[PDB]
Design a protein around this nucleic acid. Structure first.
Ligand SMILES: [K+]
Ligand SMILES: [K+]
Ligand SMILES: [K+]
Ligand SMILES: [Mg+2]
Ligand SMILES: [Mg+2]
Ligand SMILES: [Mg+2]
Ligand SMILES: [Mg+2]
Ligand SMILES: [Mg+2]
Ligand SMILES: [Mg+2]
Ligand SMILES: [Mg+2]
Ligand SMILES: [Mg+2]
Ligand SMILES: [Zn+2]
Lengths: 343, 225, 16, 36, 103, 132, 77
RNA sequence: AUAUACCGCCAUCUUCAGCAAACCCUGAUGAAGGCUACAAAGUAAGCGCAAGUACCCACGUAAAGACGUUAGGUCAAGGUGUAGCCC
């Protein structure tokens, strides 16, 4: 019956079944999903199976200065049109099938390590093209609710940085994973730390700190050492601009504790100029590749002390057994100093 | 070509003088003493970060060292005058209702702004939403009282730092000056103290605005000829 | 996402 | 590339305030914004 | 015949820019710790494996002792040590040719 | 909960027209009728035939002007005249709109044996009353 | 052709601008734009007499791009 | 066949008043939380209530009544995804 026919929108809303108890709680999963297709896309007004040529609708109205008359394509001429539409339909299906693959993160199914692009431009014509965003954690949080039972939300941790010392991180929360990405990355750009870098490649000194139960021990390293650190630290260090560092994470390996523990330690590092100003002495760098040449890296801006720094015969500094065990050749690990890809 | 000379003769010249506006002539340790600025709260109310600025305890009542107040007040007035000279937006904030009317009038008279009412969450940290994307925030916030009515720090002290706004604040012996850029140890309760502060800031701000007009006018007359 | 996400003027009187 | 067709200005802008309106709407017709 | 010319051409600059030819290569392996040796060879009886190494994936890169600009990309500029094969991802076959060409 | 002819609240991104935004209880209160004829007045006949004709004309014009209609049709009957007033978009070339007007008016005049006129009002885009 | 009171001259510059847009957005744009010498000379002169000197100075480049001889009157104004 | 794939039209709480995008802030940037009027971090579009309209009033009665709850009811109103039958 002609009167029982419906519109395309009605037919797709029913067939897709996007509203319903199946889609409310994700009670139904979709390895095979009906996909909406626009069936009016490649259709031309006036074109039908019979192949009639209507002047002014599907063919030009005037030809050679005279009005065209009703005509019909030959059976052969119409087969070509039909075949051409099928090929054009498969070409469109293949153009959509040809989608550029995006690089993976720490693993194929992991979100961690994936770039989200620069933060969105602020309302007042503000732009952050110089900043890159990296995901550090994507979690599904399940909230028990008074009336709706277990609901599913997304908590995202992302870090931003420009590669020149300015970096920050923020948590994002939303029901949708892509809204959480927007919240986290946009908020992080307003909570940027500045991290001082020695020679724009490493930290100024060894940093060992604890944040809650996460211990992070970082070592200053020379050029060419690379980033031999927890994969999350590697991600953050590329955003800050540190190229050479060793780091070891102990205790709880909690991503959030690690991120803010890492940023707390890197933001409280004393530069060489601050050391010279604090002690009013020269800072002299001795490099074995340069032999005994003394390289003054920092000199005090104020007066220069005349009294040498007291030489305590034995320092009362606390040592790490892991560092000492390594220097004494008593550290045996099959996993240490393994060959890995450039980081 | 002509902008560098403008910014050099008008904006950079005042910064080469120790007291360009002569704000030291506005007050003295005696003038502060007569306004009861040295009177602080009882020792039981003392904040530990205010101990540097306390002269002692006179029968369990803390006394503020006016020699320090004088130096801190000099810095605060000098900064405030320079910000008024540069045409910065100065916002006075206080929750003490005994002085709400006085403070609001002082702001209007000096051509500045006052917020003495309940401070709604996000006035500074969410200003674009509350006012509009083109809203200009204050360049300097002056606290005549740094505590709210429940004896906690005014939310604007924390939020001013978040928005990188310098803060001038009168800090009594029970207040926390850690986040106040230019703290001025002084009595914030006595009507004589608060009235004095309003005269000094009002005068410092008004003098700097007239100085800005004088220099500009002179810089233009000389420019034509 | 890693497969890819590819959802992918002047006016005239009496035009021709 | 051919320019997209531009809708003409509503012919109300050419009507004089002392015109003969019955000539505009002589017979029953639907409301026309460009004509009223 | 003149392998050093490829690195001076426009085709090379469009594909690699100023980064090393191995910058964007990634090994496919199970686990977080990769195998300690790379694959023996990416060209096996004239057939190329699915993920050819930085050298094998571009047939115009010729490992030759005269193409010094290519060899420098596999030596540490700060220490002068030759990167081990897992560092860059080159197969064992090409890493040996690089080590001999470098020497 | 009532469903009939109610566009449901969403995230604020769904544009609805004036007609779509008003549930049935607003008919004759905030929105008028899309067809006007005498068949439903007291003492009048042939309501069933006018109703079937209206259902056809709405489907006919939907498929005859595919993707061009920017709102529901307004059907007017005076005597034996049938006037179809449609708000359409400005995407199709004017030649195609004149062809379909001539084609539709003639075909419908012979189908229902009455003089039929089609009145087209063009809009640059669908007129949005609110974003639900 | 001739100079006019400032009120009229301003109006002629609003039309010359609209004509300039027509020359720039022709549907023969696929073919090289044909900018007659008289049109370029007149459009520039109308901008000067209206006080839109900034627009007139910019147009001088189009005399070299299209290799169109400038008119004596335009150079003097 | 499947209302446990659905559209459509509904029941129910509702003889409810809440829901909620986008922001902001607190908890060390934990799951979480965000009110005080002599106010102490919330601002909130939109939807609902409300208002308005219908009936004999501004009363009452209708109508309206969001989000969500019960994979509630209905494939047998019609349409329809999936699977099945086609002497
Ligand atoms: K249902
Ligand atoms: K059914
Ligand atoms: K079925
Ligand atoms: Mg995988
Ligand atoms: Mg006090
Ligand atoms: Mg009901
Ligand atoms: Mg059900
Ligand atoms: Mg009532
Ligand atoms: Mg009822
Ligand atoms: Mg109501
Ligand atoms: Mg059931
Ligand atoms: Zn290889």
């Amino acid at each position: 019956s002609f009167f029982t026919k419906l519109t395309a929108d009605e037919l797709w809303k029913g067939a897709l079944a996007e509203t319903g108890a199946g889609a409310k709680k994700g009670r139904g999963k979709r390895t095979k999903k009906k996909k909406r297709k626009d069936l009016n896309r490649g259709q031309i007004i006036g074109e039908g199976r019979y192949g009639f040529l209507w002047p002014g609708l599907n063919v030009p109205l005037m030809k050679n200065g005279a009005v065209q008359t009703i005509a019909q394509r030959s059976k052969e001429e119409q087969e070509k049109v039909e075949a051409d539409m099928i090929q054009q339909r498969e070409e469109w299906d293949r153009k959509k099938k040809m989608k550029v693959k995006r690089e993976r993160g720490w693993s194929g199914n992991s979100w961690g390590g994936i770039s989200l692009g620069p933060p969105d431009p602020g309302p007042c014509g503000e732009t952050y093209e110089d900043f890159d965003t990296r995901i550090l954690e994507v979690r599904n949080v399940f909230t028990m609710t008074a009336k709706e039972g277990r609901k599913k939300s997304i908590r995202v941790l992302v870090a931003v940085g420009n590669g020149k010392g300015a970096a920050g991180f923020s948590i994002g929360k939303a029901t949708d994973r892509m809204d959480a990405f927007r919240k986290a990355k946009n908020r992080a750009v307003h909570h940027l730390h500045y991290i001082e870098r020695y020679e724009d490649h490493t930290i100024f000194h060894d940093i060992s700190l604890r944040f809650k139960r996460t211990h992070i021990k970082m070592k200053k390293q020379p050029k060419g050492y690379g980033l031999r650190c927890h994969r999350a630290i590697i991600t953050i260090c590329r955003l800050i601009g540190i190229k050479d560092m060793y780091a070891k994470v102990s205790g709880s390996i909690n991503m959030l504790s690690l991120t803010q523990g890492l940023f707390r330690g890197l933001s409280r590092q004393e530069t060489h100029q601050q050391l010279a100003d604090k002690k009013g002495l020269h800072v002299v760098e001795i490099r074995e590749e340069c032999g005994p040449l003394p390289i003054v890296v920092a000199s005090p801006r104020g007066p220069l002390r005349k009294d040498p720094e007291p030489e305590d015969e034995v320092p009362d500094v606390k040592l790490d057994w892991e560092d000492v065990k390594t220097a004494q050749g008593m550290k045996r690990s099959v996993w240490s100093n393994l060959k890995r890809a450039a980081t | 070509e002509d902008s560098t000379d403008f910014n050099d003769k008008i904006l950079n010249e005042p910064l080469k003088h120790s007291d360009f506006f002569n704000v030291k002539e506005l007050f003295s340790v005696r003038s502060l003493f007569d306004a009861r600025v040295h009177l602080g709260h009882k020792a039981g109310c003392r904040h530990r970060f205010m101990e540097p600025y306390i002269f002692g305890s006179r029968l369990d009542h803390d006394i503020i060292d006016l020699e320090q107040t004088a130096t801190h007040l000099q810095l605060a007035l000098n900064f405030t005058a320079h910000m008024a000279y540069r045409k910065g937006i100065i916002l006075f904030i206080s929750r003490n209702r005994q002085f709400s009317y006085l403070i609001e009038n002082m702001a209007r008279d000096c051509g500045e702004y006052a917020h003495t009412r309940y401070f709604r969450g996000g006035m500074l940290t969410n200003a674009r939403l509350l006012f509009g994307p083109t809203v200009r925030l204050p360049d300097l916030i002056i606290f005549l009282h740094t505590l709210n009515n429940i004896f906690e720090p005014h939310v604007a002290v924390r939020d001013a730092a978040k928005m990188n706004i310098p803060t001038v604040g009168i800090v009594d012996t029970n207040c926390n000056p850690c986040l106040i850029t230019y703290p001025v140890p002084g009595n914030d309760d006595s009507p004589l103290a608060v009235h004095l502060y309003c005269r000094l800031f009002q005068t410092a701000i008004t003098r700097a605005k007239e100085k800005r007009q004088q220099v500009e006018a002179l810089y233009r007359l000389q420019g034509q000829k | 996402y890693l497969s890819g996400e590819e959802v992918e003027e002047y006016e005239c009187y009496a035009p021709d | 590339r051919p320019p997209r067709r531009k809708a003409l200005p509503p012919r109300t802008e050419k009507m004089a305030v002392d015109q003969d309106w019955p000539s505009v709407y002589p017979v029953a017709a639907p409301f026309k914004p460009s004509a009223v | 015949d003149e392998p050093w010319k490829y690195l001076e051409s426009e085709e090379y600059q469009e594909r690699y820019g100023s980064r090393p030819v191995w910058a964007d290569y990634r090994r496919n392996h199970k686990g977080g710790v990769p195998p300690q040796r790379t694959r023996k060879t990416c060209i096996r009886r004239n057939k190329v494996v699915g993920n050819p190494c930085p050298i094998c994936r571009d047939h115009k890169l010729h490992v030759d002792f005269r193409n010094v600009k290519l060899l420098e990309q596999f030596v540490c500029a700060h220490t002068g040590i030759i990167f081990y094969a897992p560092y860059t991802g080159v197969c064992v076959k090409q890493h040996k040719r690089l080590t001999q060409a470098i020497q | 909960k009532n469903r009939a002819a109610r566009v449901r609240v969403s995230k604020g991104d769904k544009p609805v027209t004036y007609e779509e935004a008003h549930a049935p209880h607003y008919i004759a209160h905030r929105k008028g009728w899309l067809s006007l004829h005498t068949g439903n007045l007291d003492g009048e006949d042939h309501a069933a035939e006018r109703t079937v004709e209206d259902v056809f004309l709405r489907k006919f014009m939907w498929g005859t002007f595919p993707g061009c209609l920017a709102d529901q049709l307004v059907l007017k009957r005076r005597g034996n005249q049938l006037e179809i007033c449609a708000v359409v978009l400005r995407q199709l070339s004017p030649h195609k709109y004149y062809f379909l007007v001539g084609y539709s008016e003639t075909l419908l005049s012979y189908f229902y044996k009455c003089p039929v006129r089609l009145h087209l009002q063009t809009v640059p885009s669908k007129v949005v009353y609110k974003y639900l | 052709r001739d100079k006019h009171p400032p009120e009229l001259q301003v109006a002629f510059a609003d039309c010359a601008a609209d004509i300039k847009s027509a020359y720039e957005s022709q549907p023969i744009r696929q073919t090289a734009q044909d900018w007659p010498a008289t049109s370029l000379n007149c459009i520039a002169i109308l901008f000067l007499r209206a006080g839109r000197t900034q627009e007139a100075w910019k147009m001088l480049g189009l005399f070299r791009k299209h290799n169109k001889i400038p008119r004596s009157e335009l150079l003097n104004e």
